[PDB]
Design a protein around this ligand. Structure first.
Ligand SMILES: *[C@@H]1O[C@H](CO)[C@@H](O)[C@H](O)[C@H]1NC(C)=O
Ligand SMILES: *[C@@H]1O[C@H](CO)[C@@H](O)[C@H](O)[C@H]1NC(C)=O
Ligand SMILES: *[C@@H]1O[C@H](CO)[C@@H](O)[C@H](O)[C@H]1NC(C)=O
Ligand SMILES: *[C@@H]1O[C@H](CO)[C@@H](O)[C@H](O)[C@H]1NC(C)=O
Ligand SMILES: *[C@@H]1O[C@H](CO)[C@@H](O)[C@H](O)[C@H]1NC(C)=O
Ligand SMILES: *[C@@H]1O[C@H](CO)[C@@H](O)[C@H](O)[C@H]1NC(C)=O
Ligand SMILES: *[C@@H]1O[C@H](CO)[C@@H](O)[C@H](O)[C@H]1NC(C)=O
Lengths: 300, 49, 50, 230
């Protein structure tokens, strides 16, 4: 087949390669059971303005994102740095939660590297943002027949805003050289402005509820991820392994190298993962590539 | 180099033992027969002449 | 000669850690974080550089 | 005044990943080799933070027992406090107002003035029990506030000894606050003690790992053209 002939002369020829196949699959996760509170992140009622955006740091739990997949109440659901269906088994160090209220038409400028008034002036999303954003209509609650004016945003300021900032000061804007000093003259303007939400307003003018979730993957040990079940370990054979999202194929073996208590895994040569600390027994396991080689056939 | 993924090395066909044997045979021939063994059958002759 | 073969081989090995404009240099992360119909456009740019 | 030479000190593990028997090049904030360090004693004026600080304290200097970091004293913004006592360490971040010159036959704490809007109140393990020298490194990136240290005995008091040392990531917190100045804390009974300050500046370094995986030697890639060749 390789030499494209029905007759072959005497000699030695290289045909193909082989690899030892894994026999089992093992998954390891830390034994943690408490559910961390997504309840008062989406079902909560007390939320803040555009420039007063709420900050919640959530950790030390396990999470099930299946509520996010199947809840039809969520109007738009667009993830970027990861595929939405894959969050069920990836494992993350920490999760950042932001909540704030935006008029419906300004949803498109809440995007990685997007330009706009809210983007450049209130809340800008970084270019390499590896998280996801959710939003849904809320005209039924955040609107009154007489008009609700409690929500404000800032739109006059000199320079662009860095990705993770918050400002609440409302100093008078010096649009001109006149030092009006707290009085809104013709050359000055008050930095804030309020959205006039009424139920008679158009759908684009209707208020919307937006929550932003961001993830980061560092070398630090992970703390929050899905309910994927763990299993017993197998040693001295070719086997597929999963360690807090780190996946591959190899042979697990005891190690004599000593890890520092703050270290987790090794990259000794050419950034290759050779050792992984066991989350349960704290013992360091060596990774060895599964056996492989070429095939040569000798014929007369 | 050391063991890692992707690539392998192949041993040479002739070992060091065989190369050393070849050199020893060449040295013995050139000290016991001069240039005669290169052209054909070796002819014994003392080193002085 | 020995050194100039060894350095070339070592530089060939080290090139596997390059990013080539992708989001990650590890292919397992690429196919474990992303949905393939938008992950092939990340795999190909590693393939070309390698 | 009283500027002193640094003598190739103040390096740390940057990536928290085990490596052994290899030479690696990294780019991160570091204290430049052979730079000025400022010497203090009887006094403790305020100093700016300036994108990272290196700190040290001589042996038998039991007077120094804590630090304090902030931007303003008037309790307008968030500020951090670290205080060591006989049983634990007081690590609280809250909008305090502080005494300008507090102190820690014995006498005790006199430090705080007010408190409001606290966020973090964990009590943690104390970091301390020809005596032992002290070294510390502080920086703030991405709202994170790594702390590095290693404790070691030396034989000379009023100088920085030679040799090499590398510090480990002992503790870390996501405070997210905007630090621009700081101050040290001293104890008193009802007394001068040396400490040093150095500032970091991003430069590319080359690190050497021994067979056990620790740091054994290092060179700076921008000090000397010979070091550039290295
Ligand atoms: C996981 O279980 C083992 C034994 O069942 C226990 O020793 C260990 O403490 C548990 N992990 C944690 C984080 O508590
Ligand atoms: C909010 O509360 C309702 C009422 O119990 C419940 O059905 C729903 O699952 C909760 N969560 C969300 C995200 O709506
Ligand atoms: C330290 O600074 C002083 C002036 O502030 C300067 O004269 C001195 O040379 C500096 N030290 C070194 C080692 O250059
Ligand atoms: C030491 O400080 C801790 C706070 O970190 C406090 O709980 C403890 O009571 C203090 N002990 C003394 C003796 O001051
Ligand atoms: C923070 O404390 C100040 C007084 O120290 C108080 O006026 C202010 O209301 C507090 N912040 C909040 C959000 O309550
Ligand atoms: C921190 O505070 C200083 C003044 O104390 C201010 O100039 C600066 O803009 C603030 N923010 C940062 C990120 O430094
Ligand atoms: C590691 O450090 C120990 C001292 O703690 C030393 O005796 C030993 O030689 C070093 N190397 C190895 C391979 O153990």
């Amino acid at each position: 087949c390789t030499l494209k002939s029905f007759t072959v002369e005497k000699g030695i020829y290289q045909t193909s390669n082989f690899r030892v196949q894994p026999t089992e699959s093992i998954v390891r996760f830390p034994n943690i059971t408490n559910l961390c509170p997504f309840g008062e992140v989406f079902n909560a009622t007390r939320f803040a303005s555009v420039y007063a955006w709420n900050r919640k740091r959530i950790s030390n739990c396990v999470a099930d994102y299946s509520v996010l997949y199947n809840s039809a109440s969520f109007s738009t659901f667009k993830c970027y740095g990861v595929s939405p269906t894959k969050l069920n088994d990836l494992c993350f160090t920490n999760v950042y939660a932001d909540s704030f209220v935006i008029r419906g038409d300004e949803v498109r400028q809440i995007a990685p590297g997007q330009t706009g008034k809210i983007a450049d002036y209130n809340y800008k999303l970084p270019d390499d943002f590896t998280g996801c954003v959710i939003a849904w209509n809320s005209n039924n609650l955040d609107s009154k027949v007489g008009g609700n004016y409690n929500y404000l945003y800032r739109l006059f300021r000199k320079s662009n805003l860095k990705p993770f900032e918050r400002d609440i000061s409302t100093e008078i804007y010096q649009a001109g050289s006149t030092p009006c000093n707290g009085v809104e003259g013709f050359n000055c303007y008050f930095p804030l402005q309020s959205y006039g939400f009424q139920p008679t307003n158009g759908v684009g003018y209707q208020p919307y509820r937006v929550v932003v979730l961001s993830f980061e993957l560092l070398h630090a040990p992970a703390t929050v991820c899905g309910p994927k079940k763990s299993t017993n370990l197998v040693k001295n054979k070719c086997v597929n392994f999963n360690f807090n999202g780190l996946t591959g194929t190899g042979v697990l073996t005891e190690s004599n190298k000593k890890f520092l208590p703050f270290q987790q895994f090794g990259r000794d040569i050419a950034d290759t993962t050779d050792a992984v600390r066991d989350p349960q027994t704290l013992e360091i396991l060596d990774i060895t590539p599964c056996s492989f080689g070429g095939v040569s056939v000798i014929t007369p | 180099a050391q063991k890692f993924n992707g690539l392998t090395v192949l041993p040479p066909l002739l070992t060091d033992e065989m190369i050393a044997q070849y050199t020893s045979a060449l040295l013995a021939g050139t000290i016991t027969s001069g240039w005669t063994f290169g052209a054909g059958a070796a002819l014994q002759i003392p080193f002085a002449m | 000669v020995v050194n100039q073969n060894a350095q070339a081989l070592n530089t060939l090995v080290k090139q596997l850690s390059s990013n080539f404009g992708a989001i990650s240099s590890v292919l397992n992360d690429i196919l474990s974080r992303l949905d393939p119909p938008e992950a092939e456009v990340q795999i190909d740019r590693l393939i070309t550089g390698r | 005044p009283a500027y002193t030479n640094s003598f190739t000190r103040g390096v740390y593990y940057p990536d928290k990943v085990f490596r052994s028997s290899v030479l690696h090049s990294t780019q991160d904030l570091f204290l430049p080799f052979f730079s000025n360090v400022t010497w203090f004693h009887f006094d403790n004026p305020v100093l700016p933070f300036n994108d990272g600080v290196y700190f040290a304290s001589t042996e038998k200097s039991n007077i120094i027992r804590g630090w304090i970091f902030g931007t303003t004293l008037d309790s307008k913004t968030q500020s951090l406090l670290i205080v060591n006592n006989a049983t634990n360490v007081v690590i609280k971040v809250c909008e305090f107002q502080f005494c300008n010159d507090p102190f820690l036959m014995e006498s005790e704490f006199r430090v705080y003035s007010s408190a409001n809007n606290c966020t973090f109140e964990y009590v943690s393990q104390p970091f301390l029990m020809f005596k032992n020298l002290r070294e510390f490194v502080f920086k703030n990136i991405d709202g994170y506030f790594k702390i590095y240290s290693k404790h070691t005995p030396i034989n000379l008091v009023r100088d920085l000894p030679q040799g090499f040392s590398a510090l480990e990531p002992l503790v870390d917190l996501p405070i997210g606050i905007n630090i621009t100045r700081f101050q040290t804390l001293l104890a008193l009974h009802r007394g001068a003690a040396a400490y040093y300050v150095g500032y970091l500046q991003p430069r590319t370094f080359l690190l050497k790992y021994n067979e056990n995986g620790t740091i054994t030697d290092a060179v700076d890639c921008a000090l000397d053209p010979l070091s550039e060749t290295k």
